[PDB]
Design a protein around this ligand. Structure first.
Ligand SMILES: [Ca+2]
Ligand SMILES: [Ca+2]
Lengths: 392, 15
């Protein structure tokens, strides 16, 4: 990755430089210099001595300050300093006031702005993930939770006595669709995060599952098995009208949207072993799009439509892999066991998924260039179905 | 218990 210097911020209620460093490394785009190896610890743009950094192959340095305010809040400021072609030039800088609970958010804001200034890619460090935890609690063992993308600041959205599956975020980040077995069978519901209001979407006979909101906010795709097998359906969210997208006796599920809100990728057993297909929601037959491997399933298409990640079987093993949608090129990304249910960061730089790490008590992160892999912090249960929020 | 009955998807007996 791109070498970069991230210096401890001048003060401590939280280690802001540590957060920036972790964020930049998580993206796979950067290789922040290990803290022990730093040549100096400048607290301001003026204290930067650019030669010590260029000597290490580093052409950008992040410095910052954290100052406490009389009202009990904190000022967090950062400055991005060029240590390459224009040594000492401030490329980017910002300063803001936050109370203690938002110090992590302050760090992620610095990460986002530094990231974007250097890569030209919008940052996703202030985003969230939704997931389901099966705890050992007896009365309500299933919880739909939300946390920051790195596992911090987790909160409970819904608790249930019965299994929950496959949460999906609305594009404005304000709602979560999910599958619940609370009534004694499957139902698809949409829950408004702010007030806890639950809208009933579908509870047809047999299975109701695998929801996905269109990027434009107008439609919800999902699968129903009422006809005798899983088929894809789309609901117009304004009216509640439902249209059948696929028909026939194969199983078609796990829909994910293309950026145009008109096409879906999805998994079908039409060819035998699961493969990924594309279909226009308005008409026409599905087209198979995965030809490499022996099995490919549970796709997520990137927000720019350039590629998709999915669970792919190659050389006998299943891992998270990425398929370029223009070239057809495929790259295996993860190396862990029992890799499943991948979900892309809204900038396409990172994938969150589930594996055997910690016997399923943790979620995993892998950068989409395959350069960096990490476990999220452990939860107090079995964690499944991660869903990466849109930009917030 | 809870399953989509596909025999293969992420919602096939996940729990
Ligand atoms: Ca999926
Ligand atoms: Ca997507």
């Amino acid at each position: 990755g791109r070498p970069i210097g991230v210096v401890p911020f001048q003060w401590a209620p939280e280690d802001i430089g540590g957060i920036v460093a972790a964020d930049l490394r998580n993206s796979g785009k950067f290789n922040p210099l290990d803290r022990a190896r730093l040549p100096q610890q400048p607290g301001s743009a003026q204290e930067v001595q650019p030669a010590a950094w260029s000597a290490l192959g580093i052409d950008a340095v992040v410095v910052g300050q954290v100052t406490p305010n009389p009202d009990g809040s904190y000022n967090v400021a950062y400055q991005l300093v060029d240590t390459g072609g224009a040594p000492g030039t401030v490329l980017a800088q910002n300063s803001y006031k936050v109370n203690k609970q938002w110090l992590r958010y302050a760090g992620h804001t610095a990460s986002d702005e530094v990231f974007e200034k250097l890569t030209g890619i919008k940052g996703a460090f202030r985003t969230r993930i939704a997931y389901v935890v099966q705890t050992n609690g007896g009365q309500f063992p299933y919880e739909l939770r939300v946390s920051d993308y790195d596992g911090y600041n987790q909160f409970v959205v819904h608790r249930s006595p019965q299994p929950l599956m496959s949460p999906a975020w609305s594009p404005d980040g304000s709602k979560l669709a999910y599958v619940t077995f609370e009534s004694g069978r499957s139902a698809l519901v949409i829950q408004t995060l702010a007030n806890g209001a639950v809208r009933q979407v579908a509870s047809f006979p047999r299975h109701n599952g695998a929801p996905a909101f269109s990027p434009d906010g107008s439609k919800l795709a999902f699968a129903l098995s009422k006809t005798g097998s899983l088929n894809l359906y789309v609901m117009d969210l304004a009216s509640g009208q439902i249209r059948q997208v696929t028909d026939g006796r194969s199983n078609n599920t796990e829909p994910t949207w293309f950026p145009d809100s008109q096409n879906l990728a999805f998994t079908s057993d039409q060819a035998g072993r699961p493969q990924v297909y594309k279909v226009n929601i308005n008409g026409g037959a599905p087209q198979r799009i995965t030809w490499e491997g022996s099995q490919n399933q549970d796709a997520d298409v990137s927000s720019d439509g350039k590629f998709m990640v999915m669970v792919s079987s190659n050389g006998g093993q299943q891992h998270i892999a990425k398929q370029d949608l223009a070239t057809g090129g495929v790259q295996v990304l993860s190396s862990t066991f029992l890799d499943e249910t991948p979900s892309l960061a809204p900038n396409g730089t990172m994938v969150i998924y589930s594996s055997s790490q910690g016997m399923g008590s943790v979620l995993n992160l892998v950068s989409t260039d395959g350069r960096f892999k990490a476990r999220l912090p452990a939860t107090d249960g079995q964690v499944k179905f991660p869903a990466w929020s849109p930009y917030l | 218990g809870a399953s989509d009955g596909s025999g293969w998807s992420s919602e096939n007996n996940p729990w």
